[PDB]
Design an enzyme around this catalytic site. Structure first.
Site, PDB file in Angstrom:
ATOM      1  N   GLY A  17       0.879  -1.177   0.042  1.00  0.00           N
ATOM      2  CA  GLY A  17      -0.017   0.079   0.160  1.00  0.00           C
ATOM      3  C   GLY A  17       1.166   1.117   0.092  1.00  0.00           C
ATOM      4  O   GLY A  17       1.933   1.428   0.510  1.00  0.00           O
ATOM      5  N   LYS A  37      -1.788  -3.638   8.432  1.00  0.00           N
ATOM      6  CA  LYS A  37      -1.517  -2.396   7.663  1.00  0.00           C
ATOM      7  C   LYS A  37      -0.333  -1.249   8.039  1.00  0.00           C
ATOM      8  O   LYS A  37      -0.619  -0.916   9.067  1.00  0.00           O
ATOM      9  CB  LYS A  37      -2.848  -1.970   7.151  1.00  0.00           C
ATOM     10  CG  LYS A  37      -2.440  -0.619   6.541  1.00  0.00           C
ATOM     11  CD  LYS A  37      -3.636  -0.088   5.566  1.00  0.00           C
ATOM     12  CE  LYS A  37      -3.673   1.388   5.167  1.00  0.00           C
ATOM     13  NZ  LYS A  37      -4.249   1.821   3.924  1.00  0.00           N
ATOM     14  N   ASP A 130     -16.977   3.493  -0.007  1.00  0.00           N
ATOM     15  CA  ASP A 130     -16.416   3.268  -1.312  1.00  0.00           C
ATOM     16  C   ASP A 130     -17.065   1.612  -1.660  1.00  0.00           C
ATOM     17  O   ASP A 130     -16.716   0.652  -0.885  1.00  0.00           O
ATOM     18  CB  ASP A 130     -14.933   2.908  -1.206  1.00  0.00           C
ATOM     19  CG  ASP A 130     -14.376   4.369  -1.833  1.00  0.00           C
ATOM     20  OD1 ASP A 130     -15.070   5.313  -1.978  1.00  0.00           O
ATOM     21  OD2 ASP A 130     -13.311   3.989  -2.372  1.00  0.00           O
TER      22      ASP A 130
END
Length: 330
Positions: A17, A37, A130
């Site tokens: 990412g 993450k 989203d």
């Protein structure tokens, strides 16, 4: 690293990412997979923005819905702030095309999960909205898990470069003449699309003869396959409406007869009391995650109205009630 971070021992890096790697880890005693993450504190500083993140995340700290991927914890290391994200290996659309066309009891099962998920957002003013194929994940029980952690297709595909409409990596800012991309009625449109796809197998607005040929988006959708029930057509027809304003709202979707068939109890509508913000079981918890302080919290909860705290209380309370309806039930 040291191969470890908190109770989680690293196990493999799944993708990249922007601000760091996305790694797979397992709780050291429990074995629980989880997605780690990574956010570089370096890179954070560099972008003259860390405040909106630091808070966007301590905020997520308290969303615990069954169909939205959970942030279990945030762990800061000398070099990175690492979000401990709920793990899910499947993707809803992948299941769609393998099943090809689902039954109504199936489309509806999934659809209820998604509609209830975004209603829980709208209600707590979150922007976890989203809804593109990449965000629609699935776990081993075929439960939908909406994921909006900028994870691309890492958990499903390993592909961290998947991008879609609405994102800067996908297209130029001006293409989306929409700061109104944060409209509740955009989520109803997208949800209508998914429903049709799940129930029909193909996409709408298709030229009626030529396979997969996008034609036009009319004000509304008149003809649909006859194998779609009247309840299903009526609902879709009310969601895929061009003018945002003539589009159905999730409040109405939730009163719809068709939509309610077989609704699991933990998903039933809740027209809440409110009252007594006097539960110390959740008062203590409102600290641990939201950060802040007891008395400050205890104070905030005497006031004669809505701070950010007389609602993070109610949020932790809503999470509780639907966790009870989930487990103390069949």
């Amino acid at each position: 690293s040291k191969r470890h971070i908190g109770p989680y021992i690293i196990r493999e890096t799944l993708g990249e990412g922007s601000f760091g790697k996305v790694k797979l880890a397992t709780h050291y005693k429990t074995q629980q997979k989880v997605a780690l993450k990574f956010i570089s504190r370096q890179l954070l500083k560099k972008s003259d923005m860390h405040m909106r993140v630091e808070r966007e995340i301590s905020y997520l700290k308290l969303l615990r819905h069954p169909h939205i991927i959970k942030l279990y914890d945030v762990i800061t290391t000398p070099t990175d702030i690492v979000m401990v994200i709920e793990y899910a290996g499947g993707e809803l659309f992948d299941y769609i095309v393998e099943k090809k066309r689902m039954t109504e009891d199936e489309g509806r099962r999934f659809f209820q999960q998604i509609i209830c998920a975004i209603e829980y957002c709208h209600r707590h003013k979150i922007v976890h909205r989203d809804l593109k194929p990449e965000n629609l994940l699935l776990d081993d029980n075929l439960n939908v898990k909406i994921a909006d952690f900028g994870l691309s297709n890492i958990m499903t595909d390993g592909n961290f470069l998947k991008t879609s409409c609405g994102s800067p990596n996908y297209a130029a800012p001006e293409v989306i003449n929409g700061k109104l991309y944060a409209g509740p009625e955009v989520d109803v449109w997208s949800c209508g699309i998914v429903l049709y796809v799940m129930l029909v197998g193909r996409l709408p607005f298709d030229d009626e003869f030529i396979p997969n040929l996008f034609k036009k988006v009319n004000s509304c959708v008149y003809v649909m396959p006859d194998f779609l029930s009247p309840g299903a057509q009526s609902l879709i027809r009310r969601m895929i409406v061009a003018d945002p304003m003539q589009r159905i709202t999730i409040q109405e979707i939730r009163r719809d007869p068709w939509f309610n068939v077989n609704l699991p109890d933990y998903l039933r509508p809740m027209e809440e009391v409110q009252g007594s913000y006097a539960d110390s079981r959740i008062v203590s918890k409102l600290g641990e995650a939201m950060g802040f302080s007891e008395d400050y919290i205890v104070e905030a909860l005497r006031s004669d109205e809505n701070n950010e705290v007389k609602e993070a209380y109610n949020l932790l309370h809503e999470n509780q009630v639907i966790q009870e309806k989930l487990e103390h039930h069949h």
